[PDB]
Design a protein around this ligand. Structure first.
Ligand SMILES: O=C(O)CNC(=O)C(=O)O
Ligand SMILES: [Mg+2]
Ligand code: NI
Ligand SMILES: [Zn+2]
Length: 331
């Protein structure tokens, strides 16, 4: 078996290899990339997402979210407090203010230490889940707005026609903005492009050991776990690398920089944080190999997780037994 230690693999496709998205994802999996739960893809030097970012200030972040932490430094939950709308221009100025700017640091390792030591004592503001794309319509390769849809994949594999669409989202980050431990909805894949700005650090647990993470999480968040069998679906729990090592949870870390793609694989739990002002674009996708994961994916039916319109049909087709109970949590 390829990649038996489940290391995060980094790929450098040629412009010729960057032409066919599906084929390249299959190639990465033939090399064992999926075993890590996350891969990095460096685009060919010839490729560009768009010509410039000079005109992005006017995007509206309708609902900025302040991420407020409770708990201890290495084991905490965060909730999202809604703030008033601001433009990307205003957000970028806020990110760079003294209150919110990245602190002086020697290197990524020093910044990681400061994140985990001080994250809980501050509340950064995240512009998350904004529908839209920054890929130029004439960018033809790995354009996250022009991938084959999940609904077409499900139709090709299973012969059923369903409603729904699947479009990209933009994320505007600042120092300490955090993504909690999670898999994708229905354990889909994700692809994330860091368009501009400061890096994003990622932690990931190999899919083959996801249940060990979930067991630790049940122990670390005992109330949350009582309230919902799939409470990691709430996307609120953080667990530091130090705590993961103490508990023998296998994981890996890697830092994404601007111009780089990350791909998360089905049932790869991931979490991370942003180093400073940045903008990422992401979307979920499927391949034939996802279908079995989608069929076995855990679901939140407590009401907290509350997901897109498109997810209904995935549950309806792939998890018909779970559909009634799950939809009762959506209504
Ligand atoms: O960029 C972020 O904040 C979160 N991204 C992801 O969880 C992803 O692309 O799968
Ligand atoms: Mg603009
Ligand atoms: Ni994700
Ligand atoms: Zn729940």
């Amino acid at each position: 078996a390829q990649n038996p230690n489940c290391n995060i693999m980094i790929f450098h496709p040629t412009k010729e290899e960057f032409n066919d998205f599906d084929k390249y994802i299959a190639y990465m999996e033939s090399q064992g990339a999926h075993r890590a739960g996350l891969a990095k893809i460096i685009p060919p030097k010839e490729w560009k997402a768009r010509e410039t970012y000079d005109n992005i200030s006017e995007i509206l972040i309708a609902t900025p979210l302040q991420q407020v932490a409770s708990g201890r430094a290495g084991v905490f939950t965060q909730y999202h407090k809604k703030k008033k709308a601001m433009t990307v221009g205003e957000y970028r100025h806020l990110a760079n203010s003294k209150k919110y700017q990245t602190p002086p640091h020697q290197n990524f390792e020093d910044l990681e230490r400061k994140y985990w030591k001080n994250r809980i004592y501050n509340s950064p503001i995240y512009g998350a889940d904004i529908s839209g794309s920054l890929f130029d319509e004439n960018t033809k390769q790995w354009n996250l707005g022009h991938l084959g849809t999940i609904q077409d994949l499900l139709e090709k594999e299973c012969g059923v026609v369903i409603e729904g669409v699947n479009t990209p989202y933009l994320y505007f980050g600042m120092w300490k903005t955090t993504f909690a431990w999670h898999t994708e909805d229905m354990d889909l894949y994700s692809i994330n492009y860091l368009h501009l700005g400061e890096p994003k650090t990622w932690y990931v647990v190999p899919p083959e050991h996801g249940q060990r993470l979930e067991r630790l999480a049940r122990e670390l968040f005992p109330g949350s776990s009582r309230g919902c069998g799939a409470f990691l679906r709430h996307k609120v729990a953080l667990i530091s690398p130090t705590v993961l090592k103490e508990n023998g949870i296998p994981f890996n870390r890697i830092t994404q920089e601007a111009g780089e793609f990350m791909v998360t694989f089905p049932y790869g739990y991931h979490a991370g944080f942003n180093h400073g002002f940045n903008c990422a674009e992401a979307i979920n996708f499927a391949t034939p190999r996802w279908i079995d994961y989608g069929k076995m994916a855990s679901q939140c039916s407590c009401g907290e997780a509350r997901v897109t319109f498109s997810m209904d049909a995935f549950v309806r087709i792939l998890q018909p037994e779970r559909y009634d109970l799950w939809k009762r949590g959506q209504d």
